[PDB]
Amino acid sequence: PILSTTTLALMETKLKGGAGAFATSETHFGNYVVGEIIPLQQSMLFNS
């Protein structure tokens, strides 16, 4: 499964945020994110 996000605020706090945040899946009151199980995204965007 991949990085799925409902609103752009959680998107740009999870992508601007740091490193190793891609495996955390935080659930808000009604908003929710799921992260990728293996680091496939940040292995591509960080290594360029």
């Binding site: 991949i2 990085l3 996000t5 409902t6 998107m11 740009e12 659930t27 009151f29 908003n31 929710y32």
Partner: protein, 79 residues
């Protein structure tokens, strides 16, 4: 003839009391239109949901879109 040797130059790694020769196949497959068999093309499939529900005075919000990533690293939008 079967017991004669020659030296050359090669780059050796030492990997846990083992010596393995690294070798690059670029200099044999350069500028030829024969595709190198060492570069395959895997086909991984993904999946992602949109519009779920979370069970249980500002209320919660029910989603209707889903924002994903991109090869060009832009924010996607599926709704």
């Amino acid at each position: 003839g079967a017991h004669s040797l020659t030296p050359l130059s090669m780059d050796v790694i030492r990997l846990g009391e083992k010596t393995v020769i690294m070798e690059n196949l670029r200099r044999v497959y350069k500028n030829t239109d024969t595709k190198d068999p060492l570069e395959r093309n895997v086909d991984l499939t993904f999946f992602f949901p949109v519009g779920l529900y979370l069970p249980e005075t500002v209320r919660n919000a029910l989603p209707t879109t889903a924002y994903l990533l991109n090869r060009d690293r832009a924010v996607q939008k599926i709704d």
